[model samples]
Each structure stands twice: as structure tokens, then as C-alpha cells.
Target: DLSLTNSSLMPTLNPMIQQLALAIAASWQSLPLKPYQLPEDLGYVEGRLEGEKLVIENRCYQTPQFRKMALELAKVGKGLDILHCVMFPEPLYGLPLFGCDIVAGPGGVSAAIADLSPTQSDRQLPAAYQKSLAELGQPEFEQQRELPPWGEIFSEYCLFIRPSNVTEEERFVQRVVDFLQIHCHQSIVAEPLSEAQTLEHRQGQIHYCQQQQKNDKTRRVLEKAFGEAWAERYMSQVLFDV
Candidate 1:
């Protein structure tokens, strides 16, 4: 089932409030999903997982500028204060559920590494504050390297696919596996799943791609076969499963 929520403080005059909504909309749009192709038949429902098979598409965006903008925005007005209040209500039992992982790629990973390191000078600070400060001091921070669990989440019981050759596909799978290895500390087999291993009611997953110079033609064919919305949504859903 699909879901949508608008949590904007629309009636407020605060610049930060206005900026928050704009930022969220901008960030959402910045992703490759075209607004015109949003699925129509996929209506939102609560607690419904009707299909036997599920697919989720994943895409990575390298947006260091946008990330920095978000940070800078947070420092102005009452942004930082409000954010701190929302992220860390009280010091007693740690922060509330803010959201999912944020750091995924190199920039995110590097920032996270910096945030988790220790400080060289001895100083007194709140436990949570000190923890964040210490993260900035780690040796990895100096190297601008990042550890695993960098803004990623894994979904089970789904098929993952990307538009690429066998070698490229294998590399994508390996990258995921390597990240998982570091975070989960558990090994995963990056092999094709058999029909029997997949949901009985579902057909096999397909990874579609075109020759380097034939992307437009291939995409048109796919759209004609699956309808533009379904084709794009299906491709996206499959990627998230992996």
C-alpha cells in the first residue's frame, strides 16, 4: 500500500517553517522519480500488504551541496534550537524516534565518521553531546573515511534489480554486501535466487537495460509494454528490495 503525509506547518509565519516545507518538497523532487508518473492505482491504505510478491527500487543521489544547504538552514533562526528539541526532548533516556538512517554515501559517511570520533582535549559535556563530539575526534575522521551503516536500510522478502550488465549488477550487489558486512558483521551470499526461493504466486524478477546508445528507444519500448507509470514504479520498487 502507498501512503502520503503532509506535516507542514502551513499556517505559521516563521521563515523556518516555510523553509522546512519547501526543503522537503525540493528534496523529494530532486530524486529521479518524476511527479507526472506517480502511480494512480496504488492508493494508500493502512496496514495492508496484499501482494504475495513485493518490489522496491532504490536510487542513489550524490548531493553534497543540498546536504550542506540543509545543515546551514538548520543553523539559522530558531532552527537549531527547534531541531534539538524535536530530536532530543530530554536528557533522561536519549532522543526519540527522529527517522531512518541519513548517511549513505561518501559525504554522508565522512560526516558520520567525524560525528562519532573522540575529542583530543579533556572537557565536560552532556553524555549525548560528548558522544557526538567524541565521534568527531576519531582517527577515521582525519582520513575523511566512513564506516558502515551509513544511511541505509535493507528490506527482506523482495526482489532487487538495476539497469546494468551482469558485471555491473554483480558489482552493485557486492557493494551492498560489503556495506552490510561492515554494519551487520554477518556475511551474505550475493547470488541469484531460484524460482522456488521466490514467492509462489509471483513471476521472476526482470532487470531491464539498454545498449549504451539506445537508452531512449529501450525506455520507450518499456513504457509501451508496461505503461510509463507502471514501468517506472516497478523498476524503482525492485531496486529497494535488494
Candidate 2:
């Protein structure tokens, strides 16, 4: 309903992105999602990059166990496309943060990363999540990407790769779907914590956001396209709002 542009005028999204968008929507559909309102400017925004146009669109939802389940899609002309999804736990439920992202350009997929980051002080996922995730064997990938310095929050099972071909792309998609399915199913069975425990969970969420903000590659692009002030607001208020 917040869509401002007509479909015909929009540039085509990457084929992989089209699959990811629909799959993510379907995964979230398994939960009793309640629509979450985003700031007017962030819902759908446009910026200038060289002579090409940059468009960023976002969708957010909430459930009993999750504070926010946000999916962001961005495009720069037909050259670059990005899909980022993060599920922030309500804290009390002690759920691991569910996150995955894909960055693609005309060249091919540059980065594909997925993780169920822990919110516990020990940086370990809940017992249920650990067992379920362990059952999903590690799939072979062509290239394995090393984690960035701020990647301490990620679990040992995090998958980061540069998918080589269509076969690899589809495999990556299915893995992400598997990760989401496990997260969604586990969340329904989660039990809320006490007031003191809830406070601790909230602190962990703060730390997660703090570490994520260190990704300067994301900030640089935003600052160039939008102003410093606008970029800051987009990062704090939309992308990683806690």
C-alpha cells in the first residue's frame, strides 16, 4: 500500500532477488505477523548515484516472540541489487537473531551471508536452536568468505560464500529457507523470561545493533547518495532500530 511508483516504470530486480523476496515473504507468513509501521521517508526512498537512480524499499512485521522482522531491498539502476533481512527477538523469548543478506551486481553474486546470531552473554544459541541447526549439515560452497572484525556476534554455523552459478544460487536459497523455517518454528515454542532476565536480553539486543553499525561499507554508500544526516537516520531508525 505504501508503494509510490507504478510497476511498469520500475527497473527489473535480479532473478535471484525475485526468488529471495518471495521465499522470505512466505517464510514470515508462517508466523502470526502483525504489520509494523516504518517512518514515512524510509518506507520507500530514492537517491542519486552518479546518473543512475537508487531505490530502497522495506517491509516490517512483528510477532509475539519477535520485536521486528524487517526485510530491505535496494537497487542501483540495473547494476546493483541488495537484499537484507533481520529478525530482532523480543528479548524475553531468548531467540537468536535471524539474519541473512545477498549483494549482487552485473558481475554476479558478490556476497551471500546467513546467520542466527546469539543474544546470550556467552554468545551461544538456545538449546533448541542449537540442536535443530546442528541437524542441518553444512553444505559445500565454492568460496567461503571470512568474517569481518565485528563478526563476533555470529554463531559458529554462520554461512558466508560467493555462490558460483545458478545451481549454487538455488542451493543457497534453500539453505536460507531452511534457516528461516527453523527460526520460525522454534520461536513459537519459546517461553518468555522474567523481568530481570528480560532486561538482560534487552542489553544483548543493544550490543548486536552496536556491532552491526560498524559496517562502514553500508554507511559510505548511504552517505554519498543521501546526506550524512539522512544516512544516520536511515541506519539508526530503520535498518538497525533497537
Candidate 3:
């Protein structure tokens, strides 16, 4: 069996992500995809995660403000799960992309990793952006109940929370609501990048996506379910568009 093989016959997506996706859809305007950008049918995977689907759905869209925004949600049997409700602002925006993950399955637990992932690493973002994000995140990061050796998987600014009760779940969801409000609204205020900076940003995205393709637990399961080659293609073409 591969790293992602699962044994549960009654696989399902959890409720927390379903609730989160609804808020994201309400907050962001929907963007249509070009014929070339559309994704494949999730018929099989859907039966597992989709069989028990939620009314709170995810969406993809383009806005006058943020060129393309995609919110994703998926849950498998357990740890190999996802809720990729992130935004990749149009490169021209020169903005730090927002990322908030609440990953874990059952066992009364979840791991939170929420940050505005930076494209240009050496420099700093606007003081308001950094300060606001830090204020919102620091307290949340302090709540991880069970610590794991996350290594480089979780970023320096990541809020790694391990929740074991309803209070923690509420905290995680509330924090998501708060963080998304700040991150998405603040994006509208970003300055467009110079052509040179945009080019560098594209290259940086290729590197970032490639790194996640290697170790992202969701992709690991996808590789096992769909085969390695297909999973790699899905990652490049769909999840991490370049």
C-alpha cells in the first residue's frame, strides 16, 4: 500500500470545512474558468468525500479586484484530507497570498496552519498587513493542544493548532472567519507589481507548487488513488496552476 491507501468503507468529508467553504463563497465573487482551465470529474473521489457532501460548497471565480480566486474542499477517511480555500491573487497584485488550513480527521483533533504565504521572501509587506495578520494569528497559534514535528510543512507564521473539543472547533472556525475577512478585504488594497516583479513571482510560484506537490498529504492520497503520474499532472494543472 502507498502512503495514502485507506481502509475505511464509509469515508466522508467533515463538517468544519463545509461550514468554512460557505463563508468563502459568500465573501468572494465567483470567477469562471476558461475551457482550458476546467477540471476533471471527481466522480470516484466524490463518492467518498462527495457521497456525504455539504450544502456549504466551494467556488472558483474572477473578480475585478482579484483576478482569479478558487476555494476547494475535500475530506477523505482521516488525516489525508483538505480544505484548500486559498487565493492566488493575480501576479500583478504583488500581494501576499492568503492560506488557512484546518486539517485533521476525527479523534477529536485538527491542525491549523493559517498564514498569508509570501511570494517575495526577503522583503516585508505593508505594516498594516503584517501587524493585523500577526495580531489575529498569534493568539490562535497558541492553542495547538497536541504538537507534532511539522518540520518545514508548516511555515514560520503558521498557526499549528490541535483541537480536541467543541470550543477549539469554534475557535478554529471563528479564527478562519476573522482571518479571511482581513486577508481578502486587504487584498483589494494591494499595489500592482512591476513587470519584472511579476516575472519573478511566476517563477517563485512554480517552486512553491513543486515543493507542495512532493509532500502535501492530499496529493499523496491522490497519487495512490489516481496513480503517481496522474496525481502529478493534477497538481500541476489544477491545484497549483502556474
Candidate 4:
């Protein structure tokens, strides 16, 4: 398998989003981990979008604590593309979900949603960590990053602003890099939950997954291109494989 460390593997994504995914992966490298066994349908996972030729690529890895992170990218055609990367922590810690999804295409129809998924409980994010996000904040992007969650309620730093210049674009990428670096590192430093808390956390994850599995956006995109069956399989086997 080719390493995701290279951008050549994901041709459709904007360069900044590509770099952001790679950078986020790098920041989490110190954690104990192993690649997950993707279902071998006589091959590894790779496919074309509904009506296009550009292939989508994906890889999932599991942490010792049983957390899973998956990276995905695809270019449908023209300027349209999808860049998705998310880290789902083991339900035990109530850790934040860490990563982002970036979609860029014609008509400035670009969506950059970067966020920390909150566990059901009010687990405190460190002050310094939140400060990192504040420092990376941009005024031009003020109204752009509002993202509603796919299922359970969540938060994000949204984007679609065509930067004034490459300088701002670089800063946008830097902001994501800085925020992920701090967020990922801080979220992973955790202890297992107590028996009662563990139960609650597990229940929370189940609820979230159940709702996300029925995601309307995913269903619409997949069904529009391929068909209902294909969408069902992807949703059941890949998107919410948990």
C-alpha cells in the first residue's frame, strides 16, 4: 500500500486540505497503533465516484486503545472533490473526535469543517488547547465554518473563503495544522473510564453511530451516483463500520 504521506495518492483534494490531512496524521504518530484489516473483497478498498473516473482511496488504522482513524479522498470530476479524515476515540475516555472534511469545487462551493467531537459528558478541554484554536482564528473566515453535525451534535471551524492571497491560504492550512497538533495530542493523553462511565460512554457511542449511519447526506450522495444498494453497503461496511 502506498503511504498517505504523499499527496499524489489523492489527486482530487485541494493541496491545502491534502496537507492538513497528512499533518493531522503526523501529529498522532507517537500513539501506539496498527492498521486495521479492511474487508478483503478479493482486494483493497478503492472505487470511482457515481459517474466519474477519479478513484477514491481509503485506509483505517486502529490504536491500542481500540480507537479508529480513517482517511479518505475522491475527485468526482472538474473542480469537485472530497477530503475526509476523522479519528474516533475509544468510547472509554470521552475523548474528542479529531479531524476535518474539506470539499472544494466550482462556484466557490467549498466546505471546510474542522472540529472536535464532544463526548456525551462535559469533559474539559485544556485552556491552552482552546487558546491554540483562538490564535489560529481568522476574521474573514468568521461566518464560513459553521457546520451542523452528521448525526450527534458537534462543532467546527468552517471555511469557504477564497483567501485574499496564497499567504492567507497558507495561514488557513497552518491554522488547521496548529489546531490538530494541539487537539490530537491533548485528547490522546487519557486514562480509561470507570465502570459506570464506561457504560455511559459506550451507550453514547452507540447512539451517535446509529444516527450517523442513517446520514441523509451520505445516502443522497451515494444513491445519486451509484444506487441505493451501493450506498447501503458503503454506509454499513465503511462509514459506520463500528
Candidate 5:
């Protein structure tokens, strides 16, 4: 309902997004909030096309060397911007949204020194990573297929440009949807989120509205299911428009 109301005015919305909104609606109608499995590797990767080149920004916490190689590749074909030694999951003691700046040089492809300043440790790990760790039972990181515990709601913006006309920027919008298709090394049993669980979440929201007090337990449950940072980031500042 919230998504429908929010997206009602956009006629050119992506069909995949519309399907995802319906899925979210179904989840809100269902009870007990059944878990969903993501079909793709669930983590954040930023990419964009500037001129004829593609720029990719991957956030790394533990595997710097691997990220270094990725950066090198981005440099040979595309321009590189190293943001050295930055701390991940910024706004520490709260969520896992990391922050850094883009550098213009090759050697400068690491995080800045000041970005590594120590902070409080009361941060919640991203849900995708937590789910992967639980499922795999290994923290040793590698790029592999994995499903996230909670569904991800994302907005994507794309542009098409011609060589002769570069000044005008055209915008296209889409919602990136990846429902959990499997979990715990097994296929998901239900169809996305059942109608019952969807209803419960909606009722839960109403209950919170009436109580005027935050439902910390419910919030934690959702975060645990979704991934703390993924939900927070998607809920807060992500949108697609021209």
C-alpha cells in the first residue's frame, strides 16, 4: 500500500518494480512474516557509466587485497578513483552505511587515512553478510552465490547518451527486486511472502502507530531478517528519478 501510493504517479515505472511492489504488498498482508530468499548475491555495488567508460565502486571491510585487484581492473579500462583506508559502515555505533571519497589518481585508490579513525563498536552488520555467515559457517570471504534473509527494495537509474550530444542528461528509473528464492541451502517453500505475513506487518505498523513507542523487538526481527544496513539504506535515501 505504501509502495503503491508512492509509485502511483510514475507511468513509466519498470514492470519488475511493479511486480516487486505487489510482492511487498503480499508480504504486508501475510502473518508471522515468512522468510524470503534472494536469487542473486545480496550485497551493495555501485556502478555508473561516465562517457564511454564504466565506474564501479565496491566497499570492502576485510578484504583489501581483493578489492585492490578489482580497482586495478577498473583502472585499465576505466578511470580509477582510489579512496584509501576508509572505515566501512559509517555513522558508527548505529548502522552499516560506509562513506568515502573518490580520488582521481591510480596510486590513490585506497581509503583516506582520516577515514579510518576509530569509533564505537555498537554497529549492526549488514543483513546480507550476516545471513551468508550463518548459512556458510565460514567468515573467510569470497565472491559466491548466496541469498539474503530479507527481501531488498532498490531503485535503479540509468542513462543513455550519444557521442554527439553529451550535454543533455536523460534519465530512466527502475526498481531492482531480488526476492529470496532459497534459504539455509534449501529452496524456499512458499510463494515469495504469503498473504498472511503481509497483513501482520501492516497490523504491526498500526500497533506501533497507536502505541507511540517504537517496537524495538519487531524492528530487530525485521533487521535480522532483512539485514540492518540494507533495510536502513533502502528505506532512507534511495530513489530513482531524472
Candidate 6:
């Protein structure tokens, strides 16, 4: 397969957003991956929002441990760009979900977050993940953001912050790189759960997706640009489909 170059894909994006997007795509490439088909329309969507061009590009893939590894890049007018990514395990596999998102505009990045969210019944990261995350050490940011009430699925190692400057933005990107690498490394070696535990694992993953669907901010944008039905389809079938 021809490797996708980040620069060729998003040259006009904000520097911080582009850097993290490139890093995330690069990390995914390092893993054994294969394309996962998406619905024709949702694969690439375009709409008008307040007389500005609104574009959404989605790329998805699968691997031994994961069912869907999706990366979505969106741009609204010249003012806004977003990068949202999620890696959902196959459910039978005992691995946490990996997610990251960045919202940037001319003013700078307003929100940046990344996590290896637990999909286990206890809502805790795996033992190996806990140890690795602890050793990675916590890096400080100028402004930290609190997780929403629906963020219980996120692991203790989750990072959410508003990067104050170039230095802080770069630090956040590097941390995400570490998180991606650790998750990918563990994913390659993870084994499937026992027959009796498979259903439990599936339910846990469903709960995570359900909690994420509660974020109204994403839906509001899609609804205004497209219709209510289209936005619902995009969110449920494409963005967080179980």
C-alpha cells in the first residue's frame, strides 16, 4: 500500500493540529493495518455552514486487535479545523479504546485531549497499561480542562488541556505520540478474552460509545450543516458505530 503523506493531505491546517495529525497517522502506519470500508457518503462529506465550506474526511482501518481505527479530519471555512481519532477494539480482544481530538482555529487550539480509555467492567486500565502510563510521567500544562461528567470511561492517564503557546502545543503532541505508541505496542500482544467474558467485554465497549454519543457539541455542528437525520446517521453509524 502507498503510505499517505500528512503534508499532502492537510497543508492548510493550523501548525499544531497538522503536527499531531501527522504524528497520529504515522503511529498507525507503524502497525499492521488494513483498510476498513466506510459507507460511501460518510467516507468524504461536504456541506455548507453559514455560507462557508464545511468538509469532513474520514479514514478507517482494522488490525488483529481492533475492529475499527478511524481518523476524521474536518474543516469549516478557513477559520476552523478539527482532528478526531478513535481506535475501538474488536470486543473479543482485551484492549482499551484509544481516542484523541483537537479543535483549532485562527486564534489557536481551544481544546486538545487524548486517552487510552478503559472498556473493562472495573473502568480501570489494564495492569500493563497502568505501569507504562505511570512511568511515562505527567507533564504539566498552563491550563488544564476538567473532563465532562460523561468521561468516566477515560483512564486516569487521560490528558486534556488548552495549550497556551507553541511550546505547550508541542508538548501535548509528544505526549499523544507516547500514548499511541504504548497502545499500539500492547495491542500487538493482547489476547482475546475467555468465552464467558466476551459478552462482558462487548457490553463495556458499548457503554463507552454510548457515553461519547452524549457530547452534544459534535451533533449540533453536524445538524446545522446537514439535516438532523444525516447528522444522526453520521454520528451513530460512522463516528461511533458499535
RMSD in angstroms, all models?
A: 21.9, 2.5, 7.2, 3.7, 19.7, 1.8
Badly placed stretches (over 4 Å) of model 4 are 5-8, 41-50, 106-109, 122-152, 156-168
- Estimate, for each residue in 1-242, the C-alpha lDDT of model 5 and write its tens digit: 22344432223222322333344334333322222211132223332233232222221222211111011111213333322111121121212211122223333222111111111222223344345334533221122222122211100111111111111100101111111111111111212334554343334323222331132422342244345674344223221000
Give the per-residue lDDT digits (tens) of candidate 2, residues 1-242: 21413422224666776787778887777578788888774477889745667688777888888888888888877788888889999998888898988888898889899989988877788898889888988788989999898888788989889899999999988888988889888887888788887887788888888888888878877877776788888888888876
Q: Tens digit of lDDT per residue, candidate 6, span 184-205? A: 8898777767976677778888
* Candidate achieving higher lDDT, 2 or 6: 6
Candidate 3 TM-score to native: 0.72
Cα lDDT of model 2 overall? 0.82
What Cα-based lDDT does every candidate model obtain? Answer: 0.23, 0.82, 0.56, 0.61, 0.24, 0.83
Q: Rank the candidates by TM-score, best first.
A: 6, 2, 4, 3, 5, 1
Runs of candidate 2 exceeding 4 Å displacement: 1-11, 49-51
Query: Where does the lowest 10-residue lDDT sum fall in candidate 1?
Result: 81-90
lDDT of 5: 0.24
lDDT of 1 by residue, 177-198 (tens): 3322221111111122244432
Q: Quote the RMSD, in angstroms, for model 4.
A: 3.7
Top TM-score: which candidate number? 6
- TM-score of the candidate numbered 2? 0.92
Show the lowest summed lDDT stretch of 10 residues, model 2.
1-10
Residue 44 displacement in candidate 2 (angstroms): 1.0
* lDDT, residue 21, model 1: 30
In terms of lDDT, the best-performing candidate is: 6
1-242, model 3: which lDDT tens digit per residue? 11112412213555665556556655553333321233663212332232332221234556544444655555553454466655666667666666666565655446656655666645355465678767764553345543344334334555567665666677777766776777666766777779998876666555556655565665656655555676677677666666
Q: Please, what is the TM-score per model?
A: 0.18, 0.92, 0.72, 0.77, 0.20, 0.94
TM-score of 6: 0.94
